[PDB]
């Protein structure tokens, strides 16, 4: 249950900062793209947000590996800890689903 249909970006930061640990993550509805999803991830005591693209033919992170479903995208990044990297090259790790 990393998938939280009910909450906003702000509420996701609050949840991760108070009930999560570094590595905690969840997925939630995107505000800036109605109908789409976003990952909210805690690292070093702060929260980063990562938009998930759904083109209708696959899901991806606006780049990188393509997936048929959102659960398979989440699974792949929980299994491949080095593959999710910033512009400046630091890794964002999806370690612990926040249920």
């Amino acid at each position: 249950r990393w998938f939280h249909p009910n909450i906003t970006g702000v509420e996701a930061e609050n949840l991760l900062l108070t009930r999560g640990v570094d590595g905690s993550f969840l997925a939630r509805p995107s505000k800036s793209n109605p109908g789409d999803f976003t990952l909210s991830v805690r690292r070093n005591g702060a929260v980063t947000h990562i938009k998930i693209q759904n083109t209708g033919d696959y899901y991806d992170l606006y780049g990188g590996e393509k997936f048929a479903t959102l659960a398979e995208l989440v699974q792949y990044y929980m299994e491949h800890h080095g593959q999710l990297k910033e512009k400046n090259g630091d890794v964002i790790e999806l370690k612990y689903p926040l249920n």
């Binding site: 970006g9 702000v10 930061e13 702060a46 929260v47 980063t48 947000h49 990562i50 938009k51 992170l61 606006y62 780049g63 990188g64 999710l84 990297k85 910033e86 512009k87 964002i92």
Partner: peptide, 7 residues
């Protein structure tokens, strides 16, 4: 909210 820029 801080949105990461990837790659």
């Amino acid at each position: 909210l801080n949105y990461a820029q990837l790659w």
